[PDB]
Design a protein around this ligand. Structure first.
Ligand code: NAD
Ligand code: NAD
Length: 292
């Protein structure tokens, strides 16, 4: 018999850590009712991964069975892939940062609207158990001053982008919790000899709260997050982690599916886009302050 599936055909682009996780999740029962994994695109000659076939980029853009593209490649290639798939009429889910350029991001949102497609930038950091804790903590409190520092191993800027972009998840935490921020200063310390880098950013909330955001990367440095928020009524210097954020990417996919089903209000869609663009704008400005 001839039956037209009501499910959205998905192609995963880039099979690194994120891509592998997306492929795994697309096989989960939580993905069964609305999504159909068609294949994956890779710059390497894999041919297939288990029962999932590799499809050339050219064929993926042409295929009428593909309705959605998950862009999981390195940051520097996101812009190009997003543009090609939107132009081809496919909905797009892309891992943050969607681009390494504010202007480029503006262009892509406009293109998505033009083609009537959903463009979704994944931000699992807002779905973390640790963030739920912070959301409850800041509720009804006035931020006087605070600091958020994240340390980790070296990361190739050429592939993942400038630190403000590669670590935009930390900035997203701050903007989500305290609203739009104004940039006061930004400094970048680079010791390529020791594969070391430290970016220090000073931001200000609309309530005069002063925030310090530091991103540090160096050999041997363990992945650590330091939080210190001082409020007018109470303080916070530690965020517990008792879970492992299981199925966090499926939670993000669930949001994307709600958009595909057109079950997200215009207001919610607008608020999210405004936040995304504000963060990308700040990252872009921070880069200029550090490089110029
Ligand atoms: N055409 C190509 O070269 C090519 C290459 C790759 C993928 N595809 C994909 O294949 C799908 C369709 O083309 P296809 O030929 O490959 O698939 P297909 O025709 O081999 O699919 C077969 C299924 O359709 C049913 N069916 C088809 N015509 C029927 C009829 N008249 N009466 C009763 N049942 C019928 C069969 O019984 C069977 O369940 C699309 O999803 C397309 O993207 C096509
Ligand atoms: N891997 C994740 O958990 C995750 C979460 C959100 C966004 N992303 C984005 O996915 C794309 C590539 O991701 P990948 O992990 O699949 O490729 P990858 O497999 O090439 O990554 C190799 C290494 O880089 C690290 N890494 C990747 N993106 C990073 C980032 N923004 N900041 C700090 N370390 C990072 C990984 O954890 C891993 O140790 C990038 O655009 C990235 O920002 C990845």
């Amino acid at each position: 018999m001839i039956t037209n599936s009501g499910k959205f055909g998905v192609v995963v682009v880039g099979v690194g850590r994120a891509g592998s996780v997306r492929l795994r999740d697309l096989k989960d029962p939580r993905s069964a009712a609305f999504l159909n994994l068609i294949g994956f695109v890779s710059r390497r000659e894999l041919g297939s991964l288990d029962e999932v076939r590799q499809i050339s980029l050219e064929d993926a853009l042409r295929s009428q069975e593909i309705d959605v593209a998950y862009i999981c490649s390195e940051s520097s290639s996101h812009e190009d892939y997003i543009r090609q798939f939107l132009q081809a009429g496919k909905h797009v889910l892309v891992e943050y940062p969607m681009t390494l350029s504010f202007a480029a991001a503006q262009e892509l949102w406009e293109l998505a609207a033009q083609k009537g497609r959903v463009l979704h930038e994944e931000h699992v950091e807002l779905l973390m158990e640790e963030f739920e804790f912070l959301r409850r903590e800041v509720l009804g409190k006035e931020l006087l001053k605070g600091s958020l520092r994240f340390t980790a191993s070296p990361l190739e800027e050429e592939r993942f982008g400038f630190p403000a972009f590669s670590g935009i998840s930390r900035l997203t935490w701050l903007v989500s919790l305290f609203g739009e921020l104004s940039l006061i200063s930004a400094t970048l310390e680079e010791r390529k000899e020791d594969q070391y880098m430290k970016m220090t950013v000073q931001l200000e909330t609309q309530n005069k709260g002063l925030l310090s955001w530091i991103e540090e990367k160096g050999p041997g440095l363990k992945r650590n997050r330091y939080v210190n928020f001082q409020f007018t009524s109470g303080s916070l210097e530690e965020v517990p982690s008792v879970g492992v954020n299981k199925n966090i990417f499926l939670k993000d996919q669930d949001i994307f599916v709600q958009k595909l089903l057109d079950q997200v209000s215009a207001e919610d869609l607008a608020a999210e886009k405004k936040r995304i663009m504000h963060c990308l704008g700040l990252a872009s400005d921070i880069q200029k302050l550090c490089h110029q």
